[PDB]
Design a protein around this ligand. Structure first.
Ligand SMILES: Nc1ncnc2c1ncn2[C@@H]1O[C@H](COP(=O)(O)OP(=O)(O)OP(=O)(O)O)[C@@H](O)[C@H]1O
Ligand SMILES: Nc1ncnc2c1ncn2[C@@H]1O[C@H](COP(=O)(O)OP(=O)(O)OP(=O)(O)O)[C@@H](O)[C@H]1O
Ligand SMILES: [Mg+2]
Ligand SMILES: [Mg+2]
Lengths: 463, 463
DNA sequence: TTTTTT
């Protein structure tokens, strides 16, 4: 047969070009998988791999028309599709893949077996990926300044390290984290360090993903989150001001699912794979429209309690309760960070933290006791018990306290209930929470019959 | 005699390429029908079929331009169109078609007679399609944990295993299903299991198809469900909060018809075939704009009452009325599900359930008792009976009860209606319903004359 | 208004 078909067959035999389910062709060039929806990178591969072919086939690949013919043959012979990005414990670079389990770096065919379509965007360097380096001690000093290693801050520092370490994993995560602190506290420095550590796997979007409907019309903000591993949203408005849009809880529930529904402009694709940890940098406590048990299990908070002040205003910052330590700031730090001085030391520290927590299994846990707005419900869980058959026999005491056995179940009137809950809740500050909770569980037998099926745990105890 | 014309004729004589009603070209490659509007599948078929042609014809198909010429001839010889997807009880795979009546698996020409344009996307394997296997024993434990085999849960469990097995049929279903339950009850685990079981026949869309207008401009969220067999909408918000939009009562009526009007981007096709079971998983019960009899015959509800909790929060879970049992959570189940460990066992269980409920005939029925919003409309039909001619002779007794004859019809004026209706419904909870009802059925004989055409059943029985 | 469409 003709030599062009033989060249196409030999190229296909190396498995350097593949077709995905989304309809795009990926090519293995320069030790990386690359694709482009508007430029057919196939011809680049044809020109690049001309050296591996024998001598009599190299000369005919210098003409663009024969390259077009070979690309047409390859497109004809390529029929079926394959799946991509199935290994959550591999970190891809521009010249290889790093294994997070043991720490070796793989290049060439060894890295080809893990079909990763995303990368940091820069080459990995072994010389700078060391522990004993002049930059490392300085980075450790900076980090110990931001998060001191004290017995009081141990628990917060653990969440800090775990949340930062989770950015290397390519799996769905069921919790999003808030970075809370005052001004000049080090939150943006941490953001820029993470950006300079992970490169193109990092992205930041607007706040419209938390207050607006996601699936109405085109929405590039949701679409750009596909296959990313870290998403930052920062500088939320103060909700105390009038006209502020409160955070939608259903958006929070949707953002923790493995697939997110959204559509970019001029597109028909509506599914996006969610691999990104979500970090919200803020200065004020969040406010939600509706609070329920489903929302409280997807929220975590990390505190920042160190101030970096000019010498002129130091004496003022020492009189504030929002700070636990005041230190002079360095003016040249931001320029050093912008030049990627601490890229590989921070990456090495992130991998070292990855071994500590996520090797058995990757999991994030909520911290519902850090939000004041969640206080009302939490202690409600420790004060009331739903009515049951076991409470019927002891009615002798409950009728003494004012309970009524109505339809063979122990019951308490709303009017009888409200003062009883008023003795343990400050009616002035929790005025709205009490009327909120009473109305979603009222039970009315008749126009004049009112009752609620709950029993206090203190009354159930034997006196 | 043109050689390429002869090749085109021999290719066409094998019935390997067909033209559909929508203007698409379907090609039989690798024991499956495939079609795509952007890729040249005809050239792929021409290249693939060259081994069946005699040796003096095979060498001519190695040149792409000759393949384009044969493609042009084939396009010229296709003048008549055919119907597709007419067998509802056949499950298509990537390498064959499975019969749901007897259980046989067909491949090759035997499967070609069923013109199926969709597939699960993965190959069938009879080795793992067995009943005795460790994965089946594991899977039955999860299934029993989510839906216990107890007497109180029997009817709900049967409905649960009917709705899931309904997803293997390619017909139109006349009801919508709501998966209602509190958080951490396994609602999403069954969704993941069904996705892994059915592959490409599964689709998840947004909430706009229940709230917005489906026929204004392009709408991929409604046009991506053509010929699908399972559609999921997830996490609708709570409607108690201000600003939340309610569910269009007329939208769910269009989702039941065999044809749905919708348009993709850059497309003129406006007709979509309805073959999908529509499931919405929820944490709050839905609220509709308008309630009528046509609405109440299209809604079904399945309950989830088992809670999976960490050991820290077990004590609270036992004190919640929304749960019936609490079991320890498994942290490694999601990774196993994502790895398609329980794919073929769940497929076998779905087929076994399908043989139990749908072999005679396939139909779904509503459960209007579950929704509390309907409780008023359901009750009125049992308390009021429409006036009839046969009630005229009995009005001698009805005179003492306050009934008045108007236009030779038994009538009851508005003023005496309210205290009669107050003997069953409380004013506070049902005020908006009876106000709307009275305004929508009030009739006036004059400026000061009022009457209603209903009589109470309790009033035709002598007290 | 703007994606839509050209
Ligand atoms: N370890 C450190 N030693 C000295 N200066 C530091 C150190 N870490 C950060 N700084 C400096 O302190 C300042 C803190 O600014 P930064 O943007 O990080 O704070 P922030 O709390 O995130 O601010 P904002 O929320 O108002 O944007 C910067 O000038 C930064 O360069
Ligand atoms: N049979 C089981 N045994 C142990 N753990 C289980 C079992 N079934 C499910 N789980 C676990 O329960 C956890 C919570 O379940 P799941 O997320 O499906 O609940 P849900 O009610 O659908 O939640 P939501 O609607 O809030 O997303 C999961 O991590 C899952 O692994
Ligand atoms: Mg900052
Ligand atoms: Mg769920």
């Amino acid at each position: 047969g003709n030599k062009l078909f033989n060249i196409a067959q030999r190229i296909l035999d190396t498995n350097s070009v593949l077709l995905t389910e989304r309809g795009d062709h990926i090519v293995w060039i320069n030790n990386s998988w690359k694709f482009n929806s508007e430029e057919p990178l196939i011809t680049k591969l044809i020109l690049s791999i001309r050296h591996q072919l024998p001598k009599e086939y190299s000369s005919e690949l210098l003409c663009p028309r024969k390259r077009k013919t070979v690309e047409a043959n390859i497109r004809d012979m390529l029929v079926d599709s394959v799946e991509t990005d199935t290994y959550p414990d591999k970190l891809p670079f521009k010249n290889g893949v790093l294994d997070l389990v043991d720490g070796m770096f793989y290049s060439g065919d060894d890295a080809k077996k893990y079909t990763c379509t995303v990368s940091t965007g820069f080459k990995f360097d072994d010389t700078k990926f060391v522990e004993d380096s002049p930059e490392m001690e300085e980075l450790m000093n900076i980090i110990n300044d931001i998060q001191p290693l004290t017995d009081e801050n141990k628990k917060n520092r653990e969440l800090y390290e775990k949340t930062l370490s989770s950015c290397l994993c390519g799996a769905t995560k069921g919790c999003l984290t808030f970075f809370f602190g005052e001004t000049a506290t080090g939150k943006s420095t941490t953001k820029r360090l993470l950006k300079s550590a992970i490169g193109d796997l990092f992205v930041e979007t607007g706040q419209t993903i938390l207050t607006d409907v996601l699936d109405k019309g085109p929405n590039p903000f949701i679409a750009n989150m596909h296959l990313k591993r870290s998403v930052f949203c920062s500088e939320l408005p103060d909700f105390a001001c009038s006209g502020s849009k409160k955070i939608r809880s259903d958006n929070i529930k949707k953002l923790t699912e493995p697939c997110v529904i959204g559509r970019p402009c001029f597109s028909n694709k509506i599914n996006n794979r969610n691999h990104a940890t979500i970090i919200i940098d803020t200065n004020y406590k969040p406010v939600f429209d509706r609070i329920d048990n489903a929302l409280m299990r997807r929220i975590a908070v990390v505190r920042f309690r160190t101030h970096f002040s000019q010498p002129s205003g130091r004496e003022a910052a020492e009189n504030n309760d929002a700070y636990d330590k005041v230190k002079l700031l360095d003016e040249g730090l931001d320029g050093k960070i912008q030049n990627n001085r601490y890229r590989f030391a921070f990456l090495y520290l992130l991998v070292k933290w990855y071994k500590k927590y996520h090797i058995p299994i990757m999991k994030l846990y909520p911290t519902p006791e850090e939000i004041p707005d969640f206080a009302f419900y939490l202690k409600i869980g420790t004060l009331l018990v739903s009515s049951s058959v076991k409470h019927i026999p002891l009615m002798t005491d409950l009728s003494k306290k004012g309970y009524i056995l109505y339809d063979n179940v122990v019951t308490l009137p709303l009017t009888t209930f409200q003062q009883k809950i008023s003795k343990y809740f400050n009616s002035r500050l929790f005025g709205h929470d009490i009327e909120s909770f009473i109305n979603r569980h009222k039970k009315f037998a008749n126009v004049s019959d009112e009752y609620l099926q709950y029993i206090f745990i203190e009354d159930i105890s034997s006196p």
